[PDB]
Amino acid sequence: GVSFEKTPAIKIVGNKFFDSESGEQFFIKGIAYQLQRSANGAFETSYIDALADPKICLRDIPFLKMLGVNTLRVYAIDPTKSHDICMEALSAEGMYVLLDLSEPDISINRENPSWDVHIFERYKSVIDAMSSFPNLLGYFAGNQVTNDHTNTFASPFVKAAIRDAKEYISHSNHRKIPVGYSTNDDAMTRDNLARYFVCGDVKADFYGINMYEWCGYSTYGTSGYRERTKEFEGYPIPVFFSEFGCNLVRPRPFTEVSALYGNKMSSVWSGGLAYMYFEEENEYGVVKINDNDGVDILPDFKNLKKEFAKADPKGITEEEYLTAKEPSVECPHIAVGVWEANEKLPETPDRSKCACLDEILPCEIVPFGAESGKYEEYFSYLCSKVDCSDILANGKTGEYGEFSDCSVEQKLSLQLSKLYCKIGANDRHCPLNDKNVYFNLESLQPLTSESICKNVFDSIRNITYNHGDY
Structure with missing residues (x-):
């Protein structure tokens, strides 16, 4: 890989992703990649931007390659820093990035939501820092903002963010990178949330679910995967698991990967990203960074590697997909205490x-x-x-x-x-x-x-x- 040629830009057509050069369907085989410390007193960022530190990203890319991923999900970058080295090194190995626009301290507040000039400035800074890279797959404008029936009214604020990020991208000189949303999996809110994000005049470009239903040695039927798959058949935008890898018992078998890329699920879902690369306090890692900053591979790594290695999703080409098909959804009704996301969104911050x-x-x-x-x-x-x-x-x-x-x-x-x-x-x-x-x-x-x-x-x-x- 000499520059970015190993990663043609991915486009969205209807409810699937396609390689813009070959027209072949693109499936995400991913992992979450975000390192926690380890700065406040010295005024450094509270978060670490591994994609702005070649020492870190160049250590990890060989292990990501062993794992067999083609996509990372990144939750926070520092837009004041360069990302050329790490993004090109990812591209050289055929790897793409899905990236949140927020950072832990600048995000839509589910407890008192607003869509304001400060968060919008943050989003624009990220878009301007990262949009030059053909392997930037998409941006998330929110991540589980609404998370239960008590804060559904945060969702209009997220849709306003999607609208405004899309408009900013459209007016810019950048490639029109899609802007989507990542949600949790709360039974009472999940159907309403999926409908809301494609209803009315503003829509997410793609929809990720943080999906933890399959724990241990489960099955397509018993996990819930069959039911979720039926729910999303014909959903108008691409859908995928933004996170997966239930950790109730470890080592995790990752047998859900066989289902996800199997024939039944590959016709609906665009793949998914395992959570997560680094072993931290939450016990979801596939590697542990030691005190000297070296990578120690954990049992989960070998299981996920083996599953990705045999996952061979059957896709269809853009041409086949578009054959006999040309790609307005009602917003969910208001019910006090259950669903309280108005169709009327806040305006672009001034x-x-x-x-x-x-x-x-x-x-x-x-x-x-x-x-x-x-x-x-x-x-x-x-x-x-x-x-x-x-x-x-x-x-x-x-x-x-x-x-x-x-x-x-x-x-x-x-x-x-x-x-x-x-x-x-x-x-x-x-x-x-x-x-x-x-x-x-x-x-x-x-x-x-x-x-x-x-x-x-x-x-x-x-x-x-x-x-x-x-």
């Missing part, structure tokens, strides 16, 4: 509008290093003293306030500033005890003719001056 808040507000909280753990406490307090309707985002009802798309810190700054103005002590003491709070002297500078922040200023002046105290 960076320019939100940026005006940074300039004009008297009281602000600095994003860098802020203790986000205290934010629930801070909102409960602030919203008991001023009216937080202007930042409320309700995915149940499809109601989104004027500043609901701004960053969490911008939202806090807006309510903190409202409270400062309501109290009216005019003493530059912002009424919130956090080291990241400060009085913004730029707020004392009048907007000139003709500032691009005049409209936001008018909004904020109206909101602060007319706060319901008659």
Whole structure:
């Protein structure tokens, strides 16, 4: 492999993936690849980006090759770093990457969801860092955001992210890399979630399930795989297991691989990715990295290797697939306490509008290093003293306030500033005890003719001056 020629870009046509050069169907034979430490005090990323460190990726690629994978799933990259060496070394061995756009500390919050300028900036940074690589198979815009019947209202926020990532990619000069979603496997929500992500005017491009139903020496029938396969027959977009490898008893046989690539399942599923390469506290690994940073192969590795080696999925060509076929789904009805994802999505976050808040507000909280753990406490307090309707985002009802798309810190700054103005002590003491709070002297500078922040200023002046105290 000299450059990227061993990995032609994969495209989606209907509900299958195809090699863009040969037209042969593409099946994912994958593994999750993400290394945990082991940095905070020295301001390094909390996560490790193995794809930006040749020392790590060049160690592991020979073992990934032994294993027989053609795809990795990666959960977090650092978009400020180069990825050319590791992505090309993967390509040279015929390996592709499925990549989440989020990172552990910048993701859609299932406990208080918003689709905002900060998360969108994160997504765009990843897209711009990784889209040059023909072996970038697809991006995940969310990973099990909704996870049970109590947080289904997070799903509209994820669909907005899919829409906005797709639009950003379409307007860019990049290859049109598909954007999809990865979900869990909760019985009460699974059918609604699959329908929701292909309903209405916005759709995921592909759909991964984190699939742990087959434990030990199970079968197609007894595991649940037969039932899931029947559920997904004719589902309009490609589907695959984004994770598999139940670890109730170890060593894991990985006999589910025989079913997955067998004739019955290969007509519906596009393959899957084992979870996971590294042995960490959760006991899902196939290798252990020792104290000197060497790779020790574990019993699970040999089992998975043997299963991948004999998996020979029967695909069909693009031409055969398209023969006699030309590739609008109703969204699930709302039922209080069961399914609460409105079809009406939040709008694309507006960076320019939100940026005006940074300039004009008297009281602000600095994003860098802020203790986000205290934010629930801070909102409960602030919203008991001023009216937080202007930042409320309700995915149940499809109601989104004027500043609901701004960053969490911008939202806090807006309510903190409202409270400062309501109290009216005019003493530059912002009424919130956090080291990241400060009085913004730029707020004392009048907007000139003709500032691009005049409209936001008018909004904020109206909101602060007319706060319901008659």
